[PDB]
Design a binder for this molecule. Sequence first.
Ligand code: NA
Length: 330
Amino acid sequence: STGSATTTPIDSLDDAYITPVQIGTPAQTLNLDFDTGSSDLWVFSSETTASEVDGQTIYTPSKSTTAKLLSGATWSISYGDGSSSSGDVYTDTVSVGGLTVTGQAVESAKKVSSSFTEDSTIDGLLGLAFSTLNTVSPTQQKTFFDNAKASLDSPVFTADLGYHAPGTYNFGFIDTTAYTGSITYTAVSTKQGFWEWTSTGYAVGSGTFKSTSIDGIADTGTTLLYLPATVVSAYWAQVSGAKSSSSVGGYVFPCSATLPSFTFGVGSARIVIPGDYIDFGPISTGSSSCFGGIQSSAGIGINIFGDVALKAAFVVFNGATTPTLGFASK
Ligand code: NA
């Protein structure tokens, strides 16, 4: 089997991407944030505290003939941005892009933090990191990908995120029309439960490539590119008037600037992030200070290849017995 679904930016900045997901029978379609940095499929639901729901579409298990309470199971998750959610668990039929899993754990939120309530466009998350991070207790649950894997034509999924445009998540196949050149594969460590890999270095603009190992994660659920402070300082030093602002919480730059590209290495291959991808616009409405898309990972404890990086590439998440990542230009 295979599946193919379109993923759509939630706003004009590509802050996140939503993908429609069918849950239950008859289908209830919710727009989920596919997150390769976490391992829970959780949804706004008929159980979510009413004051914490503001425009999201909810999953109502009582209206699904295939829903069953997973008795005694609870979940609770905290993300890198300080957001959180928790609740109880149902099993139900879940389909993405035509690919169906029966008996998927659907984590029903009883509580969500303010950042979720305030984002009306995201109805929940679909985690695609390794199932070792799943938070369900006392019986850990599998991701949608791990439950689909054995049925797939190939044990893979691909992320093809758009810049200010829709893109695609595919399950079970490589679309050889979706990228240019060849795919370069690189090793993955699953020790922390992430798609963790080592970039071979970077360049700023037309500058020389610096060969240096940068360990980080491929995380579709993180907007920005978080790299070591040395690398980030080298990038922003090429933008007149850029500076790190403790008040704003990262590097800002004049909105009048033209940003340089940023290149990262994947083995001997190179992925180029155009400068435009690094512009996240005014820090507040009408400001002439703009927020940068490359930020320091110092204090986060890991480097994160978030959407700024991933949307410059066709990315293969190879879930074979020995996982690997692949990157191609597009
Ligand atoms: Na922000």
